[PDB]
């Protein structure tokens, strides 16, 4: 089979879309190659190497494919998913640019990757570790991936965490300034006690819930705002 077909097929495999010389879409838990030309590393090794970019695409799109139909995930998890819409948008932008310049091997498209698969490598942990986290337990689960030693990665999740920390800078702007907060999904640490409206108000109806504290506030910082 011809090599000029392989580049346009693996292009689609990046998007997760079906190919024609590769009929796998992570169906056998990964992509394998159908059809030979007796090329043992230029139809086999390179193709299997590049198909895992599409495997990572399947994962990162799969999470968003459910969370956008999940209406009980908070509003800090649905801003996390809104920074995870952007991370699909940029992937499409890269694919758009490469598609025009394909009009043939390009070192089997390894010029345009290897800087790709650093963001995917980081989000493969953000889309494995964060599963069933909403509220301030998520703002500590994106705050543990900002201790990374690579200067690329630390600023990568300082972008994600700049976006994620916007509702918590509006919950913190109305537990302080308005002084009363109200949410139906608890993303903040006020745990109100119902039918406390009398002179047990100064003593009760506020308990520091300890599954919604972010990790950019230590314990004392949350002990004062209450």
């Amino acid at each position: 089979i011809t090599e000029a077909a392989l580049v346009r097929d693996i292009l689609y495999v990046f998007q997760g879309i079906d190919g024609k010389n590769i009929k796998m879409n992570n169906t056998e838990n990964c992509y394998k190659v159908e059809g030979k030309a007796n090329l043992s590393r230029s139809l086999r090794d390179t193709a299997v190497r590049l198909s895992e970019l599409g495997w990572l695409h399947n994962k990162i799109r799969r999470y968003t494919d459910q969370r956008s139909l999940d209406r009980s995930f908070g509003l800090v998890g649905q801003s996390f998913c809104a920074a995870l819409h952007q991370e699909l948008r940029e992937y499409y932008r890269l694919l758009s640019v490469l598609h025009s310049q394909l009009q043939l091997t390009l070192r089997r498209l390894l010029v345009w990757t290897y800087d790709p698969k650093i963001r995917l490598k980081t989000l493969a942990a953000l889309v494995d570790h964060c599963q069933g986290r909403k509220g301030g337990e998520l703002a500590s689960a994106v705050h543990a991936y900002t201790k990374t030693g690579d200067p690329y990665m630390r600023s990568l999740v300082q972008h994600i965490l700049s976006l994620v920390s916007h509702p918590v800078l509006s919950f913190l702007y109305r537990w302080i300034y308005d002084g009363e907060l109200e949410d139906t999904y608890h993303e903040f640490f006020v745990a109100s006690d119902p039918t406390v409206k009398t002179d047990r108000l100064w003593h009760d109806k506020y308990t520091l819930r300890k599954s919604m504290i972010p990790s950019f506030m230590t314990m004392d910082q949350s002990r004062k705002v209450l």
Binding site: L110, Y114, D150, P151
Partner: protein, 358 residues
């Protein structure tokens, strides 16, 4: 391959227990380590019975793939795929003249596979920020190798690359790859992470002084690796508080109040609670090693007795070849810390009246 996954977990428990600001220290998932399709390190006839002037071209194409880890057609990567070393087997039916030249070109191939496996496996969290940065600056040279072999493929399509031309072109990067792979083997042998492979780089930068092809490489790699260390040092020098999520720093913070409390009957806070580690010093801070500990410990014993103060000035400085900017900054903050502690001590709860009344 199988061996690394053990070591990672056993090391992971230690730094997690040790530091109380380093809690729930994470790991990347298992597929990141398992599958080798996430690096570059992954018609068909016996070429020796063929005419000669096709053998060289076939081998040039295969070997050009081999250099960036993609295992070729007539060159097979021999099955071990462990340590910072790899071997390859070229065809024996190949003509002796061509095969001998292939052997001469092959050291950079092993010296690629070793490098890229280091960049995946030793960028995990337990190896800490400095080993992460060292791998991340090895990675840019790997990227440059990739950039090279793309253009050289176009040259081979044009009937313009020969094996003698290929050897000639790969000679300047062969030395660079050689330095990187030797460094990775050394980091594995001493189990060096944090500062023990910040002293290794510091010695290596002095070692090459007659070549200057390798010396600038080493200077670049230690400039890359010293940036996370100097952050912790900047915190420690201008304050008395560090965070140190994975252990790379000479100072460690112990917690005791269970024996002595409300007063120090031996000055435990001021003596041994903040102790030094002689094996994570980058061996250019070794001349300052006592003064570094004292500079922040004096801040602790002034900010605790009731005081608030910050940096003289903020300087973010890095490694320079044979040269030292940090000596001056460490001295200038040390004298300043002693000065503020002395002024506070001789006026607030003053010692003079105490000694008079003794």
């Amino acid at each position: 391959l199988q061996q690394s996954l053990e070591l990672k977990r056993k090391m992971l428990r230690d730094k997690q227990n040790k530091k109380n600001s380093g809690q729930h220290l994470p790991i990347f998932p298992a597929w990141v380590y398992e599958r080798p399709a996430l690096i570059g390190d992954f018609t068909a006839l016996p070429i020796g019975t063929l005419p000669l002037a096709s053998q060289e071209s076939a081998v040039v194409e295969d070997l050009l793939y081999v250099l960036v880890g993609v295992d070729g057609r007539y060159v097979s990567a021999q099955p071990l795929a462990g340590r910072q070393s790899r071997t390859f087997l070229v065809d024996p039916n190949l003509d002796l003249s061509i095969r001998e030249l292939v052997h001469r070109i092959l050291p950079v191939a092993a010296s690629y596979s070793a490098v890229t496996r280091f960049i995946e496996e030793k960028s995990s969290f337990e190896y800490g920020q400095v080993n992460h940065a060292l791998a991340a600056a090895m990675r840019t040279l790997v990227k440059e190798h990739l950039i090279l072999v793309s253009q050289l493929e176009q040259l081979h399509r044009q009937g313009l690359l020969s094996l003698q031309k290929l050897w000639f072109y790969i000679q300047p990067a062969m030395r660079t790859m050689d330095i990187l792979a030797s460094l990775a083997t050394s980091v594995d042998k001493g189990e060096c992470l944090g500062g023990s492979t910040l002293s290794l780089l510091h010695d290596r930068s002095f070692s090459y002084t007659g070549d200057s092809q390798a010396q600038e490489l080493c200077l670049y790699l230690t400039k890359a690796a010293s940036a996370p260390y100097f952050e912790v040092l900047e915190k420690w020098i201008y304050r008395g508080i560090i965070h140190d999520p994975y252990s790379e720093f000479m100072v460690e913070e112990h917690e005791l109040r269970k024996e002595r409390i409300q007063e120090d009957y031996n000055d435990k806070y001021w003596d041994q609670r903040y102790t030094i580690v002689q094996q994570q010093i980058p061996s250019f801070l070794q001349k300052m090693a006592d003064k570094i500990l004292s500079t922040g410990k004096y801040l602790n014993v002034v900010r605790e007795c009731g005081h608030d103060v910050t940096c003289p000035v903020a300087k973010e400085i890095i490694y320079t070849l044979k040269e030292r900017a940090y000596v001056e900054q460490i001295e200038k903050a040390f004298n300043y810390a002693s000065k503020v502690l002395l002024d506070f001590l001789m006026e607030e709860k003053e010692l003079v009246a105490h000694l008079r009344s003794i």
